[PDB]
Amino acid sequence: IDFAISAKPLTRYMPQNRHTFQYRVWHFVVSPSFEYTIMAMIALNTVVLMMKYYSAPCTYELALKYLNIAFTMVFSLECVLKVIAFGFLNYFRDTWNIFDFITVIGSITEIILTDSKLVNTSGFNMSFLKLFRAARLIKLLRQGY
Ligand SMILES: CC(C)CCC[C@@H](C)[C@H]1CC[C@H]2[C@@H]3CC=C4C[C@@H](OC(=O)CCC(=O)O)CC[C@]4(C)[C@H]3CC[C@]12C
Ligand SMILES: CC(C)CCC[C@@H](C)[C@H]1CC[C@H]2[C@@H]3CC=C4C[C@@H](OC(=O)CCC(=O)O)CC[C@]4(C)[C@H]3CC[C@]12C
């Protein structure tokens, strides 16, 4: 029970400036119209991962392609909305953000390499990049405790 040896610090992410940007976005990030509106985008994104099936009409496969993009942008827009509102160094210190950073930087590059302008050759395969967009399911584990 004597963990008073640690756990001294608290939040300490206050910008405390009423600043032009930093205390304009930080107010947006906190005070849920964002905490529940990103807990709803990781709720529909765990439904477009279950909606893949075998022999889809090729316009079902296309609706999922443009939905996956429409969640990657939202999750990437989240990513550059917390480097701004918290600062770069205070962002990469929760370990639940450098997880959400990796999944988005790994799913941004899944959209590109499976698109044109770059070829899938040189004996290296983009099949393992599907794990990065199927790892957004673990973002639901965060609201366990
Ligand atoms: C968290 C959950 C409760 C929300 C929604 C998830 C499931 C209820 C949905 C998502 C994807 C669906 C699947 C998507 C595709 C198919 C193929 C489909 O096969 C056909 O094309 C034949 C008949 C048909 O068109 O449904 C049969 C239903 C099934 C398995 C669906 C069953 C219901 C699933 C699992
Ligand atoms: C974004 C989240 C909430 C996913 C839930 C959306 C689904 C309710 C939508 C998205 C893609 C839709 C599908 C896209 C393509 C088709 C093929 C379509 O078959 C056709 O050939 C008709 C017209 C066409 O798409 O060319 C019939 C409807 C269906 C199954 C749609 C049914 C409704 C779906 C599953």
From Swiss-Prot:
All ranges on the Extracellular side of the membrane: 53-67, 115-125
Glycosylated residues, chain numbering: N120, N125
Parts of the chain that traverse the membrane: 34-52, 68-87, 96-114, 126-144
Tissue expression summary: Expressed in neuronal tissues and in kidney.
Subcellular location field: Membrane
Ranges per topology, Cytoplasmic: 88-95
UniProt superkingdom: Eukaryota
Function according to Swiss-Prot or TrEMBL: Voltage-sensitive calcium channels (VSCC) mediate the entry of calcium ions into excitable cells. They are also involved in a variety of calcium-dependent processes, including muscle contraction, hormone or neurotransmitter release, gene expression, cell motility, cell division and cell death. The isoform alpha-1E gives rise to R-type calcium currents. R-type calcium channels belong to the 'high-voltage activated' (HVA) group and are blocked by nickel. They are however insensitive to dihydropyridines (DHP).
Related illness: Developmental and epileptic encephalopathy 69: A form of epileptic encephalopathy, a heterogeneous group of severe early-onset epilepsies characterized by refractory seizures, neurodevelopmental impairment, and poor prognosis. Development is normal prior to seizure onset, after which cognitive and motor delays become apparent. DEE69 is an autosomal dominant form characterized by refractory seizures, hypotonia, and profoundly impaired development often associated with macrocephaly, hyperkinetic movements, and contractures. The disorder can sometimes result in early death.
Domain statement: Each of the four internal repeats contains five hydrophobic transmembrane segments (S1, S2, S3, S5, S6) and one positively charged transmembrane segment (S4). S4 segments probably represent the voltage-sensor and are characterized by a series of positively charged amino acids at every third position.
SUBUNIT field: Interacts with EFHC1. Voltage-dependent calcium channels are multisubunit complexes, consisting of alpha-1, alpha-2, beta and delta subunits in a 1:1:1:1 ratio. The channel activity is directed by the pore-forming and voltage-sensitive alpha-1 subunit. In many cases, this subunit is sufficient to generate voltage-sensitive calcium channel activity. The auxiliary subunits beta and alpha-2/delta linked by a disulfide bridge regulate the channel activity.
Entry similarity comment: Belongs to the calcium channel alpha-1 subunit (TC 1.A.1.11) family. CACNA1E subfamily.
UniProt name for this protein: Voltage-dependent R-type calcium channel subunit alpha-1E
Biological source species: Homo sapiens (Human)
Residues of the full protein shown: 1447 to 1591 of 2313
